Write a protein that binds this ligand. Sequence first.
Ligand SMILES: OC[C@H]1O[C@@H](O[C@H]2[C@H](O)[C@@H](O)[C@H](O)O[C@@H]2CO)[C@H](O)[C@@H](O)[C@@H]1O
Ligand SMILES: OC[C@H]1O[C@@H](O[C@H]2[C@H](O)[C@@H](O)[C@H](O)O[C@@H]2CO)[C@H](O)[C@@H](O)[C@@H]1O
Ligand SMILES: [Br-]
Ligand SMILES: [Br-]
Ligand SMILES: [Br-]
Ligand SMILES: [Br-]
Ligand SMILES: [Br-]
Ligand SMILES: [Br-]
Ligand SMILES: [Ca+2]
Ligand SMILES: [Ca+2]
Ligand SMILES: [Ca+2]
Ligand SMILES: [Ca+2]
Ligand SMILES: [Cl-]
Ligand SMILES: [Cl-]
Ligand SMILES: [Cl-]
Ligand SMILES: [Cl-]
Ligand SMILES: [Cl-]
Ligand SMILES: [Cl-]
Ligand SMILES: [Cl-]
Ligand SMILES: [Cl-]
Ligand SMILES: [Cl-]
Lengths: 599, 599
Amino acid sequence: SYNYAEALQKAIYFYECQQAGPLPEWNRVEWRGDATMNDEVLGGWYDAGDHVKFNLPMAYSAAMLGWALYEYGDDIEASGQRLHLERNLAFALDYLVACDRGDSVVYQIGDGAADHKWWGSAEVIEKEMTRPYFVGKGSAVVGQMAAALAVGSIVLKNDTYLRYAKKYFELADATRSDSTYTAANGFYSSHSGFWDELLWASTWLYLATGDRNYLDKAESYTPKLNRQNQTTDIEYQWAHCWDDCHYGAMILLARATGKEEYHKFAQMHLDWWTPQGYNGKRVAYTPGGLAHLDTWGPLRYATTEAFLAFVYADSINDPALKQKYYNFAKSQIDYALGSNPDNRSYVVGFGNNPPQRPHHRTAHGTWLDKRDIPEKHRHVLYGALVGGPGRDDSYEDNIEDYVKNEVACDYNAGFVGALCRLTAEYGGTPLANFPPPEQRDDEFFVEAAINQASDHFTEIKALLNNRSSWPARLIKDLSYNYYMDLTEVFEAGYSVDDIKVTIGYCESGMDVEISPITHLYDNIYYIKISYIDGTNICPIGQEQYAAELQFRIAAPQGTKFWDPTNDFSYQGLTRELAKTKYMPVFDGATKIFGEVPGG
Amino acid sequence: SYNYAEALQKAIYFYECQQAGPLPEWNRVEWRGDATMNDEVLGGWYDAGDHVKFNLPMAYSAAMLGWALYEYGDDIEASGQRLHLERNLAFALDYLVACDRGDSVVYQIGDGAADHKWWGSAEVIEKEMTRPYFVGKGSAVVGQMAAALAVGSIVLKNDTYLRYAKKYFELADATRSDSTYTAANGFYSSHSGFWDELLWASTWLYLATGDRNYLDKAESYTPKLNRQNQTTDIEYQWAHCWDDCHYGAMILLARATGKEEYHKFAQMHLDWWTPQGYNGKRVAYTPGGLAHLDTWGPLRYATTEAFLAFVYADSINDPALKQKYYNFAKSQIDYALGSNPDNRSYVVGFGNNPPQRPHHRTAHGTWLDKRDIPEKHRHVLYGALVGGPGRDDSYEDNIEDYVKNEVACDYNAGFVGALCRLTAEYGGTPLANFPPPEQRDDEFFVEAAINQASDHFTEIKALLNNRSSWPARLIKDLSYNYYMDLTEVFEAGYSVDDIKVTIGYCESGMDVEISPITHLYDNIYYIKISYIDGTNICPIGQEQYAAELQFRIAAPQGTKFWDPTNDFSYQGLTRELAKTKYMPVFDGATKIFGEVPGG
Ligand SMILES: OC[C@H]1O[C@@H](O[C@H]2[C@H](O)[C@@H](O)[C@H](O)O[C@@H]2CO)[C@H](O)[C@@H](O)[C@@H]1O
Ligand SMILES: OC[C@H]1O[C@@H](O[C@H]2[C@H](O)[C@@H](O)[C@H](O)O[C@@H]2CO)[C@H](O)[C@@H](O)[C@@H]1O
Ligand SMILES: [Br-]
Ligand SMILES: [Br-]
Ligand SMILES: [Br-]
Ligand SMILES: [Br-]
Ligand SMILES: [Br-]
Ligand SMILES: [Br-]
Ligand SMILES: [Ca+2]
Ligand SMILES: [Ca+2]
Ligand SMILES: [Ca+2]
Ligand SMILES: [Ca+2]
Ligand SMILES: [Cl-]
Ligand SMILES: [Cl-]
Ligand SMILES: [Cl-]
Ligand SMILES: [Cl-]
Ligand SMILES: [Cl-]
Ligand SMILES: [Cl-]
Ligand SMILES: [Cl-]
Ligand SMILES: [Cl-]
Ligand SMILES: [Cl-]
């Protein structure tokens, strides 16, 4: 119905957009550079359109990418995406290993409230704030980390991942408490508790090792799972998700053990998701056919359930059940890709009329801590599955809609597995030239205005701008030149010593020097304005993105010869601030913007 | 009793405090300089503790000082004050003549609202605002100008004053309207109308010329005077004052004509002011014995009536009446000098416990456009009679009490006449060394702090202050030096050209240059910070009284030899702003504050 291979290609590339520093050599995202290099644990993924590393959803996302490979890795080699998926997974798993602290782990980098208060690109956040880390031994977060590493060890044939999966599982299982998991409260609180994580982790360890001790542990956790309302059934009326993976664990155990209790659960749970429901109970559905679990990330939940349904349907033989679950799964993926009342993709950069304003700071590329400027995103967040429509299929592509236009690691994770299943079956050709280069705008440049003109002087207001975005970046050795023609000075009988440079305003905190008037060639002279620590010009807010200087170049009071109309840098200037190419900008000795006289 | 000669001496000196620029050579006030030199008409007096020239009360005050000389000039020669009173009067009269515009006069300089909104010294007000002038021919203001010049012509034997007195009287008499008197509205509105001024001016012209035509004009105006309530009697229940001089005119006409109608009026009016009253009717009296006409300027009204009562008493023969009026008069003057429930003088700089916080901008001497700082007045407004107490004798000396601590030309004017009469009777020795010099503060100086420090640089925050007050003044060619010892630079094998001067903050609007590092002697070098228009550093407000610059002097990054502790200008600096004598200030090439290495 769609080119699922292209969808898969893009959905994987999304994770490269999320990578924290240092970026791997193979990162394909021209607008991403090393970021948050002062973090206590390097690498891994930023969670959403923010810059926090939240280990619970991060590890969940990795576990799901691992599961995608575990089921379908061989079957996707034709799409050309297997190597891409594998190394993207390994990047996250390396971070999980790097979190080890022995009897505890680093479980978060960044403070949610502080991070979310600021809107700007990953590469410049250390200029705005200093990022904390958090250490603990929460059974849910540590258990999820163990599960991700366990499946990772299988699909990446990696003994180190298995060693760490065991370490973390032993810690989570010994601790049996979420009390030291607090830094993510209100963002990724542990809602369901930790027994589902221990189940999920022990299940994957059994699949990794064949050690029955893990299967005994797994089966021991099932009576501890939450019940459905006040009944005796295990809870089934929700989705497999970052908080609760018992759903997927029960499916894996149905297949691994063949035991009827797991099959009964899988069928009850999946039936509740399908249009026919489970004995009169059913997830809410939009009229447009999307199973709609909650206001937040409905596409995330539906596409994750599609992956579970595909895996379960593939694992059973009953034709009616297989067709029912397969049709459900495909219907949810197809909705996300464009089979909906608006006929539009909900995957950024894919398909017909995709979202163009995802709630994502670094893809947006602002310079002034605002969402509304720039009015269009500077970058394409290819592959990102957005939150999606409301319960009535309604949606508007709006950066301010932090629900419907949310994007996140966990939104993409199950989605990737489902796309693997569909590419396996239908094939499709990935895009050969992907990703294509972006149109860039000017990043470092001066805006200038004539602040005052007189018959004996020129006074310039000049703002040296850093609106970098490909990638956002800091340049220390910034300078710009203002060129003049002093022919009229010499003709009137005066010299360079008779021309005085003064300053009328220099912005606080911007260490600056102005050169003496310097000969270029002939009667062409210039001053250089140098910012000694240009990294303080940075796209982090209204005050920081440009440094303002007002400078005056003056012949003696009373003289009548001063003529700025032949001065190179005066060309086109008005009384209103405007970008000018005639006051070129330099990084050290290298010109990075503008033009020079002759030259 | 009191030393009335000293009180008179100081009461006259008050007028020198009020002189607008250009000051006469004989001005005795060390904290007054030429002020408001751009005014449309130069000289004259500021009205109160403000800087408006309001001609109606200015001319009334001049007329009253003239009247004091007319009655008592011979009788005060012993007090030594006659020549002081004469030249003080001539300064105001010269202004009145300079107001002539042919068919109209300048009757105001300054916009009352804008003037009063700002709190600062006369000499700097043109940095804060532009002062408009107003032209018209209102009969009250022009008539009072005429009267002032008519008595002035007599007592100063001056034909030019008589010529303008006639011309102004004719203009007032032709116009018979206050319609063109607009700019003083709500400050010195014409409340009584203009017939009383025509009466007062024509009476003085008769006394100056002996031309009975002026006497006939004077008598023609008396039926046009306002009535007392709804009766046929001329209004008598108020005081001779800036708005209405018919009271004094009637007294002068009683003496000049001997006619019963004027004596009947004089006695009705004066009896109403005495404790014995007129037919059971009387001005309010405080329990402490002050005749209290109104909330505003009660001492002004009572001391003016004291002068009228003295003049009328001296003009009649009835010992009972003479005693009644003399006792009234002396009681009111004595109350003002200290015969009151608090035993305290209401004349600044005189007697026991005088007011120290008069509502007077220039005597206060702020630099910040605030009344509360400085908390003590920097100057002594000797001789100013304040507004005075409430009807219950209540009073607190508070700069914020713009009623009780108001001071003005018209408050002092009648008061001077009354003091003339009392020193005529009782003698007294004026103060020999008056005025004594004031304690002065530093006026131009740098406040500096170490803003940032490291092993390769010093960064200074420097505020160049103008808190001048002796007198407040402007200096254009202001600079200050920062002296260093570069011994350690040379000791490291580096040169002067390896040291970098940069700026970290330059206050907006303060055109500034920093010299290259300049040799002084030995290994001592300096930078000069020069303000191109130092007059923008001025004591007119919170942002203007000091120019802020943050400058950094830096050795190359990575070097560790930099040594600020042998730098002359670094001595005593902390991280908090403080005045320093080691960053000396210059006016052109002349040092005006601080110290230099060596000397
Ligand atoms: O209580 C229903 C359901 O909650 C799941 O946690 C949710 C939480 O309710 C929601 O506010 C947050 O945004 O998402 C989490 C994860 O989906 C919980 O995992 C389930 O066990 C529970 O049945
Ligand atoms: O009506 C009383 C009295 O007013 C005199 O004008 C006052 C004015 O009322 C007051 O507001 C202002 O502060 O001072 C003026 C002058 O004292 C007016 O001169 C009288 O004729 C009249 O009797
Ligand atoms: Br492409
Ligand atoms: Br010239
Ligand atoms: Br060029
Ligand atoms: Br006019
Ligand atoms: Br003295
Ligand atoms: Br000295
Ligand atoms: Ca859980
Ligand atoms: Ca030129
Ligand atoms: Ca009047
Ligand atoms: Ca030194
Ligand atoms: Cl802990
Ligand atoms: Cl169905
Ligand atoms: Cl199937
Ligand atoms: Cl886009
Ligand atoms: Cl824009
Ligand atoms: Cl009496
Ligand atoms: Cl007498
Ligand atoms: Cl005082
Ligand atoms: Cl103070």
